[PDB]
Amino acid sequence: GAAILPDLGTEILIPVCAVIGIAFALFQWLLVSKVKLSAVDHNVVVKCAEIQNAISEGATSFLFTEYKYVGIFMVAFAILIFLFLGSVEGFSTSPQACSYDKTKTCKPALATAIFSTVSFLLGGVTSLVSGFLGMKIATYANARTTLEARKGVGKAFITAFRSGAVMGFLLAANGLLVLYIAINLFKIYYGDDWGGLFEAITGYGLGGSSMALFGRVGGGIYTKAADVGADLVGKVERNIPEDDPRNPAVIADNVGDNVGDIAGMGSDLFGSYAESSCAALVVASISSFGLNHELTAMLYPLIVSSVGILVCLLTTLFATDFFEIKAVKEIEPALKKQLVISTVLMTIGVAVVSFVALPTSFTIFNFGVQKDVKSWQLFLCVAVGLWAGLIIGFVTEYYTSNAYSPVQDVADSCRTGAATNVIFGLALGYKSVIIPIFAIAISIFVSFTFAAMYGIAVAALGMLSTIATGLAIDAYGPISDNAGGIAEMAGMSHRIRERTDALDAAGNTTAAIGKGFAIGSAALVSLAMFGAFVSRASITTVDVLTPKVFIGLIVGAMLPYWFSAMTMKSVGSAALKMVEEVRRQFNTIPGLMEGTAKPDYATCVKISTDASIKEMIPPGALVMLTPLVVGILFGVETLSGVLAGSLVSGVQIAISASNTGGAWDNAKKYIEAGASEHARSLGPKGSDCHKAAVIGDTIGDPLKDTSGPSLNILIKLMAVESLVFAPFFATHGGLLFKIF
Amino acid sequence: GAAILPDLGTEILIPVCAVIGIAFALFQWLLVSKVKLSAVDHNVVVKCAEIQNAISEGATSFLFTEYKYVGIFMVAFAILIFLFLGSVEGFSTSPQACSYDKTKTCKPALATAIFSTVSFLLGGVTSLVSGFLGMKIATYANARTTLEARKGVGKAFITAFRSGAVMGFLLAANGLLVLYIAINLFKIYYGDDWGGLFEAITGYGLGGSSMALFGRVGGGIYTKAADVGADLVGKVERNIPEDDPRNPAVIADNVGDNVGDIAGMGSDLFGSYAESSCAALVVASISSFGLNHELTAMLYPLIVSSVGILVCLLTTLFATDFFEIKAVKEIEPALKKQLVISTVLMTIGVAVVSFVALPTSFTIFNFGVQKDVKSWQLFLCVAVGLWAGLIIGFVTEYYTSNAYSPVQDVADSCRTGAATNVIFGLALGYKSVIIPIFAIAISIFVSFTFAAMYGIAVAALGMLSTIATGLAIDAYGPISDNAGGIAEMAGMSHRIRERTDALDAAGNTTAAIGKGFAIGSAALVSLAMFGAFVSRASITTVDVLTPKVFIGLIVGAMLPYWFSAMTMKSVGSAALKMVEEVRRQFNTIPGLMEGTAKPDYATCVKISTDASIKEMIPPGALVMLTPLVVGILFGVETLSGVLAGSLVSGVQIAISASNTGGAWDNAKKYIEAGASEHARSLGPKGSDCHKAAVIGDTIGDPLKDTSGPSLNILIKLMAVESLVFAPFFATHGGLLFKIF
Ligand SMILES: [K+]
Ligand SMILES: [K+]
Ligand SMILES: [Mg+2]
Ligand SMILES: [Mg+2]
Ligand SMILES: [Mg+2]
Ligand SMILES: [Mg+2]
Ligand SMILES: [Mg+2]
Ligand SMILES: [Mg+2]
Ligand SMILES: [Mg+2]
Ligand SMILES: [Mg+2]
Ligand SMILES: [Mg+2]
Ligand SMILES: [Mg+2]
């Protein structure tokens, strides 16, 4: 039948919560604004703002340049969507048989091509708008976090997390509202044809990850080229401190945090939210929910998202108001509490949403067959994905925090040089993948068993049902990182930079956890999409042991390595040029090393700007062209193979790269902090140990900030892309097999 | 029906070719024995012979320790095979109906439990013998190659390559002869039941790879703990030549080339020969050849191998006689011409074999159905594998030879630190996987389409039909390594080490090529055995989109990383110990650095012995217990996922590990040789560049020598294990799903 919550209640609840979310984000922005500063001790406060503006400008300058290219591609690709999807029915204007029920009549395919194009641009534009906001808050709160470190750790933490929360809640509340609006607009046209409505809607997730792919890779290349170049000439060669205003690469470095770690990461996670929702929507759309036009249950994913915002609001209070940090050793435990608190609160929240927004019995589309499903079983589906994420977080903290043996052993290995650091870090990351895969596998079993592709898609949404807290703890990191850079560039005391270093180290672990959630839910949503693709393409069986499927499987598995090779070599070449420029200045600019002369910052921003824009194109092309090339030339069976192989394979290298990189970084931080006998034993800064740690750190740079986190996008992009173009592929694809 | 070559002919041809192969091997050993030496300039001949005996005593000593444990595991596991296989039919002795033809009576499953246990023992013993014979010729030729370098590269090349050819021809002939003997012996029992005869024979490949896994990993840890320790302290820290006799780790280092690179590699490759032949034989046994009891066609793979021995003998003469080398740039193109001549000669050879050993039409078992296949279609299956090999060879060379831009840019990247060197090598390896994958996929498609699992098994055998030559160019490598090691320890002329350094660099490429052939054919044979497993397990369909299969798939893709984490951490830990020990002697033994006092070589041998023997157990357990654990607990459908997933995933990390390690090695070799302006400007030895190169090389050491080459064994091993245990898993498996 129907549920306790009436459709009208759902129609109110969803945007009410979105607006509560947007409201809450503006509140925290206002609080952060209470910290005053301007560029026209008090003398520090002007240097801090003079610096913030250098970064703010540089960040903005890059994103605008990046957006110019990405928006053009967005428009070109939106045309490809219209053409290809429009061509299935010969661009007819008449209705046809429903793909999901020949007895019924649907809206014309050509209408769906148009709405798929529309939802795509919606998603593309919402994606670019996601990273840009996050950059604005990050570049607003960075210097404000510096200044508040003149009052202790706990105060600086607060403004960084408040600001992290601003990014998290704006992104979460705005992605939900745009979807909700899109759905309801689209509905005026589609009427009773919900199947085609949400099939149109799925372009939203395609729009998101498409633009996110270029943000993560483009921003990733900008930031890490500067990162390696600055750190190498500065710390390893000239023995000057990290983030030293003498170093001409420090602006690009700190611009880079916002441009990649914030902007790219923001878009990245939006794509995760959107795909997850869309996936749950397309499967529900042709299940009992959509066939019986029951709006509430249909919009179950958005309802879960809405309560999610509320829960995270309550949670955030525990760190921003209810509690104060006194000891550096409290920072990480504080951040982790957010995960634990919200996971527990949300377990209750989903129980409630399940109990009032679902019928006790319904059906779920199951490869041609309605499957009998109980609401307590959907409860377990979203719950298993929610807990899988907490587990993933806990494991990721274990392998990347310097408060535990794995990372401490790695710092230790510096006693014998960079070579043993690199060897220990590689092995650490390979080691780190075990439990996450297991968490994911359990998630898949539990969710697949209960509710087919819907359960999986809803388990993915489950893992991202706390997306606002997740983003907040993550965005806090690059905000903290920028803060310690403003400290060192304004020549503030040793006491200041020690506090930001404690915050930054926590944000390193935070960033790996985000990377983990991104990878965990990507694996889930991609499987759901893979399944929905197989159905929509009218494949009977994806039989592993057939030539078309296997060559697909083995080639698809090779894809994330190819992508890695591009992006790694990309940073490797750009970083090589950066080293040469920093040297050129330290060697040919008189008085520079002395501290009397000014470094040419712009040259370093130009080097990493030139490299990122030229070199984001091939890996993007690789990921967008593959579904099309394989789908057109080889056919849906093969594209099925490519979808399975790139999922199972790309996940191992994504987890291991991000963790290895995170580890080398925090090992390096450990030595630099000297907060224990062992830590001090490997120092001081400048030591042979410390330098080995820096070598390891800078190899981890592209691994965890360019190639690593982007690999989760490669997977989930190719998956929607395949789902969206499925009708085209099944009709007009397979060419090499037809013409022979 | 019958073919041009009568059953009796085939019975004669095969062992005659094994005997011809064994005679060739002995002949070369004889010629190499002409280089006379002994430990009773003249001092320089004497010093070489004392160094040779340190190494020989060392390598013989270790393998015996290793074989003690491996041999014990071999016996334990044979018991498990007997128990688990015999338990299928309640250890009954009553004959039952042939599952391939119910009108016939077959030998009891108990008989197959016994004969599987026997073939496993044969296989593991042969594997043990293969690696031992390899070490023995290597530890004989090593110093003879040193003395011959006094007369120049060409003469030295000859005795190193003649020697590699000794190992190659023995291993190939003895491997073929054993399999041939086993088949005929078993037939006395099975009579007309060739289904079960050849199902018994499949244990041979299982025993072969089982022992190889331990050989490869044990020897791998031994040698790379030494290598990394020696190089880092000696070259990077104490500024002394590589392989300096003052360095305490040098004897272990050189022992290790014989113990991993030779014994482990030899065993590894034998496993590939046994498995590929075994897979071809099982599918044939329940196809028209086995069912119609046609011996010649049934033994088609052993005939291909017989003709391969002959073809390789002729090919060998081109490098051994018909041409001498006069310049260093002629070394690599000679080794490559071995590949090219053998490939061309074997295409003819296989056309001939296919013309006279097969009837023009026959059927091949294809998942229940007899599939109509023609003899020229089988020609293409082995030839596509054969040609895929050569392609893999050319591409691997382009990526690991310092005569090309990939490695030279890597050497060049040293100019900016160890960090950039590592980033370039990591990127290089990721880049390298692409074409071999395509070669493999094309191989799979062509062979899969034409003759299902038999075609694939025969493509694998195709890739390895030139196994004598393949081994010869490979085993040549560690022999050239020892030669330069002996040269440095004997304080011989610099002109001597310049020559061996040219030989050694060639063998670095050759080693990567050998790695590629092993990986390429591992993927082929594993897919063949996957499909055979599926029939044997009575699986109707491996559908990727089931909960049971998918979880297997994603977990299976993770195994290759779990394995890499273990092996990497092991070498990393043992190397750390080695460095400490080497430092201790340099820092505390008076006279050592000054060449007055003698270092202690035994402590270094003891550290690498202690670590290899202990730490080879867990990764061996992971590989061998996985099929048993997943099979018993989850069932055959989940095991299916694990096989697909570990194949497509392991193959990528194996390729990139091996090539990255190869790249770094030859990069530093390029700097060490300064044979162009570019190379010279990165020098001289000891420069900041050289030391970045050395770091990279040492990170590469475990990647290409412990972890990398073993992954191919993980892959192909979990496949025969599953095929062999399929009846046990089908019947008594999937407990978790039965108790719920
Ligand atoms: K960070
Ligand atoms: K070698
Ligand atoms: Mg840095
Ligand atoms: Mg940064
Ligand atoms: Mg920084
Ligand atoms: Mg960091
Ligand atoms: Mg960094
Ligand atoms: Mg070495
Ligand atoms: Mg060696
Ligand atoms: Mg050597
Ligand atoms: Mg070498
Ligand atoms: Mg080495």
Side-chain angles (χ1 to χ4, degrees), chain A residues 467-480:
Chain A
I467 195 64
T469 287
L471 278 172
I473 74 170
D474 197 318
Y476 144 92
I479 287 168
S480 286

PDB file of all heavy atoms in Angstrom, chain A residues 467-480:
ATOM      1  N   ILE A 467      26.993  12.727   4.635  1.00  0.00           N
ATOM      2  CA  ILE A 467      27.894  13.440   3.731  1.00  0.00           C
ATOM      3  C   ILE A 467      28.349  14.826   4.232  1.00  0.00           C
ATOM      4  O   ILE A 467      29.435  15.287   3.884  1.00  0.00           O
ATOM      5  CB  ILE A 467      27.242  13.551   2.316  1.00  0.00           C
ATOM      6  CG1 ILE A 467      28.249  13.949   1.242  1.00  0.00           C
ATOM      7  CG2 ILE A 467      26.094  14.534   2.327  1.00  0.00           C
ATOM      8  CD1 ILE A 467      29.319  12.943   1.028  1.00  0.00           C
ATOM      9  N   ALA A 468      27.535  15.480   5.057  1.00  0.00           N
ATOM     10  CA  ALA A 468      27.849  16.830   5.525  1.00  0.00           C
ATOM     11  C   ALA A 468      28.933  16.830   6.612  1.00  0.00           C
ATOM     12  O   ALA A 468      29.845  17.666   6.593  1.00  0.00           O
ATOM     13  CB  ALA A 468      26.596  17.522   6.022  1.00  0.00           C
ATOM     14  N   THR A 469      28.818  15.899   7.561  1.00  0.00           N
ATOM     15  CA  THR A 469      29.866  15.677   8.553  1.00  0.00           C
ATOM     16  C   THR A 469      31.139  15.157   7.886  1.00  0.00           C
ATOM     17  O   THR A 469      32.250  15.584   8.228  1.00  0.00           O
ATOM     18  CB  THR A 469      29.418  14.682   9.643  1.00  0.00           C
ATOM     19  OG1 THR A 469      28.469  15.318  10.507  1.00  0.00           O
ATOM     20  CG2 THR A 469      30.618  14.213  10.477  1.00  0.00           C
ATOM     21  N   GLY A 470      30.974  14.239   6.935  1.00  0.00           N
ATOM     22  CA  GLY A 470      32.096  13.696   6.190  1.00  0.00           C
ATOM     23  C   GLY A 470      32.891  14.776   5.479  1.00  0.00           C
ATOM     24  O   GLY A 470      34.123  14.832   5.570  1.00  0.00           O
ATOM     25  N   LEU A 471      32.180  15.648   4.778  1.00  0.00           N
ATOM     26  CA  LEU A 471      32.826  16.736   4.079  1.00  0.00           C
ATOM     27  C   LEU A 471      33.449  17.704   5.070  1.00  0.00           C
ATOM     28  O   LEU A 471      34.520  18.261   4.812  1.00  0.00           O
ATOM     29  CB  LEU A 471      31.826  17.470   3.188  1.00  0.00           C
ATOM     30  CG  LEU A 471      31.543  16.830   1.831  1.00  0.00           C
ATOM     31  CD1 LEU A 471      30.400  17.559   1.157  1.00  0.00           C
ATOM     32  CD2 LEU A 471      32.797  16.848   0.961  1.00  0.00           C
ATOM     33  N   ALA A 472      32.781  17.907   6.202  1.00  0.00           N
ATOM     34  CA  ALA A 472      33.232  18.902   7.167  1.00  0.00           C
ATOM     35  C   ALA A 472      34.581  18.527   7.788  1.00  0.00           C
ATOM     36  O   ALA A 472      35.517  19.350   7.805  1.00  0.00           O
ATOM     37  CB  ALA A 472      32.200  19.114   8.234  1.00  0.00           C
ATOM     38  N   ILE A 473      34.685  17.293   8.288  1.00  0.00           N
ATOM     39  CA  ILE A 473      35.960  16.822   8.809  1.00  0.00           C
ATOM     40  C   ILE A 473      37.041  16.851   7.731  1.00  0.00           C
ATOM     41  O   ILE A 473      38.171  17.217   8.024  1.00  0.00           O
ATOM     42  CB  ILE A 473      35.884  15.437   9.494  1.00  0.00           C
ATOM     43  CG1 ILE A 473      35.726  14.314   8.473  1.00  0.00           C
ATOM     44  CG2 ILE A 473      34.788  15.414  10.569  1.00  0.00           C
ATOM     45  CD1 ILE A 473      35.888  12.939   9.074  1.00  0.00           C
ATOM     46  N   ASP A 474      36.678  16.526   6.488  1.00  0.00           N
ATOM     47  CA  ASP A 474      37.607  16.577   5.356  1.00  0.00           C
ATOM     48  C   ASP A 474      38.038  18.000   5.008  1.00  0.00           C
ATOM     49  O   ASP A 474      39.230  18.249   4.911  1.00  0.00           O
ATOM     50  CB  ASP A 474      37.039  15.861   4.120  1.00  0.00           C
ATOM     51  CG  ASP A 474      38.114  15.528   3.063  1.00  0.00           C
ATOM     52  OD1 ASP A 474      39.009  16.372   2.782  1.00  0.00           O
ATOM     53  OD2 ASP A 474      38.050  14.404   2.500  1.00  0.00           O
ATOM     54  N   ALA A 475      37.092  18.927   4.832  1.00  0.00           N
ATOM     55  CA  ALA A 475      37.424  20.296   4.404  1.00  0.00           C
ATOM     56  C   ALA A 475      38.229  21.074   5.462  1.00  0.00           C
ATOM     57  O   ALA A 475      38.992  21.995   5.143  1.00  0.00           O
ATOM     58  CB  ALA A 475      36.173  21.057   4.031  1.00  0.00           C
ATOM     59  N   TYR A 476      38.026  20.691   6.719  1.00  0.00           N
ATOM     60  CA  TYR A 476      38.797  21.180   7.853  1.00  0.00           C
ATOM     61  C   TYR A 476      40.298  20.998   7.625  1.00  0.00           C
ATOM     62  O   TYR A 476      41.105  21.812   8.069  1.00  0.00           O
ATOM     63  CB  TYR A 476      38.364  20.436   9.127  1.00  0.00           C
ATOM     64  CG  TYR A 476      39.489  20.164  10.109  1.00  0.00           C
ATOM     65  CD1 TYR A 476      39.780  21.057  11.134  1.00  0.00           C
ATOM     66  CD2 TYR A 476      40.252  19.007  10.018  1.00  0.00           C
ATOM     67  CE1 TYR A 476      40.807  20.813  12.032  1.00  0.00           C
ATOM     68  CE2 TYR A 476      41.284  18.755  10.908  1.00  0.00           C
ATOM     69  CZ  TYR A 476      41.560  19.660  11.912  1.00  0.00           C
ATOM     70  OH  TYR A 476      42.590  19.403  12.793  1.00  0.00           O
ATOM     71  N   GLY A 477      40.658  19.915   6.941  1.00  0.00           N
ATOM     72  CA  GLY A 477      42.045  19.607   6.639  1.00  0.00           C
ATOM     73  C   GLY A 477      42.754  20.633   5.767  1.00  0.00           C
ATOM     74  O   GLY A 477      43.730  21.227   6.198  1.00  0.00           O
ATOM     75  N   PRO A 478      42.284  20.839   4.526  1.00  0.00           N
ATOM     76  CA  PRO A 478      42.970  21.816   3.673  1.00  0.00           C
ATOM     77  C   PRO A 478      42.864  23.243   4.215  1.00  0.00           C
ATOM     78  O   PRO A 478      43.668  24.099   3.840  1.00  0.00           O
ATOM     79  CB  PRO A 478      42.228  21.692   2.341  1.00  0.00           C
ATOM     80  CG  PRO A 478      41.629  20.329   2.375  1.00  0.00           C
ATOM     81  CD  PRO A 478      41.245  20.108   3.787  1.00  0.00           C
ATOM     82  N   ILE A 479      41.881  23.495   5.078  1.00  0.00           N
ATOM     83  CA  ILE A 479      41.743  24.809   5.696  1.00  0.00           C
ATOM     84  C   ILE A 479      42.837  24.965   6.742  1.00  0.00           C
ATOM     85  O   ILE A 479      43.487  26.011   6.830  1.00  0.00           O
ATOM     86  CB  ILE A 479      40.345  25.016   6.315  1.00  0.00           C
ATOM     87  CG1 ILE A 479      39.300  25.217   5.193  1.00  0.00           C
ATOM     88  CG2 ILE A 479      40.361  26.189   7.305  1.00  0.00           C
ATOM     89  CD1 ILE A 479      37.854  25.158   5.637  1.00  0.00           C
ATOM     90  N   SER A 480      43.050  23.900   7.514  1.00  0.00           N
ATOM     91  CA  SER A 480      44.125  23.842   8.504  1.00  0.00           C
ATOM     92  C   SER A 480      45.497  23.905   7.845  1.00  0.00           C
ATOM     93  O   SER A 480      46.388  24.592   8.332  1.00  0.00           O
ATOM     94  CB  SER A 480      44.022  22.571   9.352  1.00  0.00           C
ATOM     95  OG  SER A 480      42.957  22.653  10.290  1.00  0.00           O
TER      96      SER A 480
END
